[PDB]
Amino acid sequence: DDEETTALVCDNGSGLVKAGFAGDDAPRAVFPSIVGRPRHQGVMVGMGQKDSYVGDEAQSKRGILTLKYPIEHGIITNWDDMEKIWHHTFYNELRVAPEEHPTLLTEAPLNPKANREKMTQIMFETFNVPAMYVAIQAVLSLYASGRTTGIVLDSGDGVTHNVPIYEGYALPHAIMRLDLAGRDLTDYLMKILTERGYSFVTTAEREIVRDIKEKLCYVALDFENEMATAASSSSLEKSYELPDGQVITIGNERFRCPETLFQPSFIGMESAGIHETTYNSIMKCDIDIRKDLYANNVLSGGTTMYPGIADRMQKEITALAPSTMKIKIIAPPERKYSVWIGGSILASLSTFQQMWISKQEYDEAGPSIVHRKCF
Amino acid sequence: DDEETTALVCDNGSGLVKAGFAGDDAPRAVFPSIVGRPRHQGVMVGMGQKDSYVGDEAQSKRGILTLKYPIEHGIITNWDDMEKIWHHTFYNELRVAPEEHPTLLTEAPLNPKANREKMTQIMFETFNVPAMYVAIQAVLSLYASGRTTGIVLDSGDGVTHNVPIYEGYALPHAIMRLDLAGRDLTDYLMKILTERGYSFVTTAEREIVRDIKEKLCYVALDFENEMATAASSSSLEKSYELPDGQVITIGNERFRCPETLFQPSFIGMESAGIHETTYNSIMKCDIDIRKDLYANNVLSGGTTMYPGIADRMQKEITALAPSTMKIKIIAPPERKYSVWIGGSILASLSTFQQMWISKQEYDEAGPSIVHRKCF
Amino acid sequence: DDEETTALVCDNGSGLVKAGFAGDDAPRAVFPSIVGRPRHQGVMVGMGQKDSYVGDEAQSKRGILTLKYPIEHGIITNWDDMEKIWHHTFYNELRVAPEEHPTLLTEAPLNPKANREKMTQIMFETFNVPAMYVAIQAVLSLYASGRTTGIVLDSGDGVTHNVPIYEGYALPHAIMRLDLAGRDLTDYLMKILTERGYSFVTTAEREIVRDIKEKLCYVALDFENEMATAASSSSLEKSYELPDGQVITIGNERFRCPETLFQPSFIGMESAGIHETTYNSIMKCDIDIRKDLYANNVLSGGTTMYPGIADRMQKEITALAPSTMKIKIIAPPERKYSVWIGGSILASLSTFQQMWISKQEYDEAGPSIVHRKCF
Amino acid sequence: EDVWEILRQAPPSEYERIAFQYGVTDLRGMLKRLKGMRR
Amino acid sequence: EDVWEILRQAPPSEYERIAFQYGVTDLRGMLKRLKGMRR
Query: With DSSP H G I counted as helix, E B as strand and the rest as coil, what are the percentages for chain A, rounded to 5?
Result: 40, 10, 50
Burial group, residue A38, by CB count within 10 angstroms (0-12, 13-18, 19+): middle
d(CA A354, CA A373): 12
Q: Which residue of E has its CA nearest to C44?
A: E16
Report the sign of the C-alpha dihedral through residues A15, A20, A24, A28, in that order: negative
What single letter denotes the amino acid at residue A317?
I
Is A268 in Cβ contact with B171 (below 8 Å)?
yes
Report the sign of the C-alpha dihedral through residues C361, C367, C369, C373, in that order: positive
Chains D and B touching, counted as 3 or more CB pairs less than 8 Å apart: no
Q: Which residues contact B173 (CB under 8 A, 6 or more apart)?
A: A267, A268, B284
d(CA C238, CA B315): 29
Chains E and A touching, counted as 3 or more CB pairs less than 8 Å apart: no
What single letter denotes the amino acid at residue A147?
R
| Experimentally determined by | cryo-EM
Which of C39, C206, C266 to probe by mutation at the A interface, max A CB count within 10 Å? C39
Q: Which residue of A has its CA nearest to D27?
A: A146
Report the sign of the C-alpha dihedral through residues B71, B76, B77, B81, in that order: positive
Which of C244, C246, C247, C248 to probe by mutation at the B interface, max B CB count within 10 Å? C244
| Chain C partners within 8 Å of E14 (Cβ) | 48
Among the partner residues B22, B147, B342, nearest to E39 by beta-carbon distance: B22
A275 Rama sector, left if φ>0, alpha if ψ -120 to 50, beta otherwise:
alpha
d(CA C231, CA C225): 10
Q: Which residues contact D22 (CB under 8 A, 6 or more apart)?
A: D2, D3, D6, D7, D10
User: Residue A154: phi, psi to the nearest 5?
Assistant: -80, 70
Q: Which residue of D has its CA nearest to A340?
A: D28
Give the β-pairing of C16-21 and C29-32.
antiparallel
Q: Which residues contact A311 (CB under 8 A, 6 or more apart)?
A: A221
d(CA B163, CA B335): 14
Query: What is the enclosing helix (H) or strand (E) of B6?
Result: none
Burial group, residue A370, by CB count within 10 angstroms (0-12, 13-18, 19+): buried
* Apex B322 CA angle, B316 and B323, nearest 5: 90
Is E14 in Cβ contact with C48 (below 8 Å)?
yes
| Chain E partners within 8 Å of C46 (Cβ) | 12-13, 15-16
For chain C, how big is the Rg over CA atoms in Å? Answer: 22
Q: What CA dihedral angle connects C366, C22, C93 and C138, to 10 degrees?
A: 70
The number of angstroms, rounded, from the C-alpha of B118 to the middle of its chain's C-alpha atoms is: 21
Among the partner residues D17, D25, D35, nearest to A23 by beta-carbon distance: D35
| Chain E partners within 8 Å of B168 (Cβ) | 16
Q: DSSP 3-state assignment of D17?
A: helix
Tell me the nearest-neighbour CA distance from E33 into chain C, angstroms: 16
Burial group, residue A79, by CB count within 10 angstroms (0-12, 13-18, 19+): middle
- Asked if C133 contacts C104 with a C-beta cutoff of 8 angstroms, the reply is yes
Q: Which residues contact A284 (CB under 8 A, 6 or more apart)?
A: A171, A173, A174
CB-based burial, C199-221: b 16+ in 10 Å, e otherwise: ebbbbbbbbbbbebbeeebbbbb
Other C-beta atoms within 10 Å of D9: how many?
A: 10
Chains C and D touching, counted as 3 or more CB pairs less than 8 Å apart: no
Tell me the nearest-neighbour CA distance from B277 into chain C, angstroms: 18
d(CA B117, CA A31): 44
Other C-beta atoms within 10 Å of A292: how many?
A: 21
Among the partner residues A40, A201, A268, nearest to B271 by beta-carbon distance: A201
B358 bridge partner residues: B131
d(CA A92, CA A84): 11
List chains adjacent to chain A, taking adjacency as at least 3 C-beta pairs closer than 8 Å: B, C, D
The distance in angstroms from the start CA to the end CA of chain B is 30
| Chain C partners within 8 Å of A371 (Cβ) | none
Report the sign of the C-alpha dihedral through residues B202, B206, B207, B213, in that order: positive
Burial group, residue B304, by CB count within 10 angstroms (0-12, 13-18, 19+): buried
Q: Which residues contact B64 (CB under 8 A, 6 or more apart)?
A: B36, B38, B39, B40, B41
Residue A297: closest CA among A287, A284, A309: A309
Chain A residue set in contact with C, beta carbons under 8 Å: 75, 109-112, 114-115, 171-173, 177, 179, 265, 268, 270-271
- Asked if A267 contacts A260 with a C-beta cutoff of 8 angstroms, the reply is yes
Is C48 in Cβ contact with E13 (below 8 Å)?
yes
d(CA B19, CA B38): 28
d(CA E7, CA E16): 9
Q: DSSP 3-state assignment of C19?
A: strand
- Asked if A340 contacts A103 with a C-beta cutoff of 8 angstroms, the reply is no
d(CA B131, CA B136): 18
Cα atoms in the 13 Å half-sphere on the side-chain side of A164: 24
| Chain D partners within 8 Å of A104 (Cβ) | none
